[PDB]
């Protein structure tokens, strides 16, 4: 729950540099977020041809983060794919289903063997 916050702070740190890099040497001053988060995903979108050399170094070091982010997310998908869940709606004898089947919408049914000690 704390990944997107520090990624947002890093996005601001990256976007603050290309303002002054273009200021030292015509539409991507405050619009660097639209280029930056759009090229996180590498969506082949025509945005802007970068001219600042330090901005090109920053794009080069940001694209490796973009590679390893999708690598780690495919790793997260594979790790969740390993996790085959076995969940049950009923927890035990104290179930809310064991009060009245009219409480829930499908009318269900359960019984035992006849003449049982159960």
């Amino acid at each position: 729950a704390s990944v997107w916050v520090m990624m947002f702070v890093m996005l601001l740190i990256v976007s603050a540099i290309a303002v002054f890099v273009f200021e030292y040497f015509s539409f991507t001053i405050g619009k660097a977020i639209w280029l930056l988060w759009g090229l996180v995903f590498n969506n082949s979108v025509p945005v802007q041809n970068p001219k600042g050399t330090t901005s090109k170094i920053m794009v080069s070091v940001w694209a490796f983060f973009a590679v390893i982010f999708l690598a780690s997310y495919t790793a997260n998908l594979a790790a969740f794919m390993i996790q085959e869940e076995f969940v049950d709606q009923v927890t035990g004898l104290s179930d809310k289903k064991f009060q009245r089947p009219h409480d829930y919408s499908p009318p269900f049914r359960f019984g035992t063997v006849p003449n049982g000690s159960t």
Binding site: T91, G92, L93
Partner: protein
């Protein structure tokens, strides 16, 4: 453990349940009560009961679903529609 396909799924391992045992019923005043109970603990305390349970049990046992992910996409696009409405009312 012998179910074809393992479709029916048990619930827990007897946690909110009776969780009792199976003894041997004898008449009141039987002299065999001590000796049979000695034989039981001899049959358990050597893995022989575990060998029989290994003989008579089988401890064995697939599709795509992203409905939580699609619900998150459908909620974030509604949030984006609200953000577009913020610009629309301006």
């Amino acid at each position: 453990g012998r179910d074809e396909g393992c479709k029916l799924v048990t619930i827990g391992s007897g946690y909110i349940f009776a969780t009792t045992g199976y003894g041997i019923a004898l008449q009141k005043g039987s002299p065999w009560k001590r000796q049979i109970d000695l034989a039981l603990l001899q049959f358990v305390g050597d893995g022989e009961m575990e060998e029989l349970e290994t003989l008579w049990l089988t401890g064995i046992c697939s599709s795509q679903l992203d409905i939580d992910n699609m619900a998150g996409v459908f909620y974030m696009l509604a949030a984006a529609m609200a953000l577009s409405l913020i610009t629309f009312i301006w």
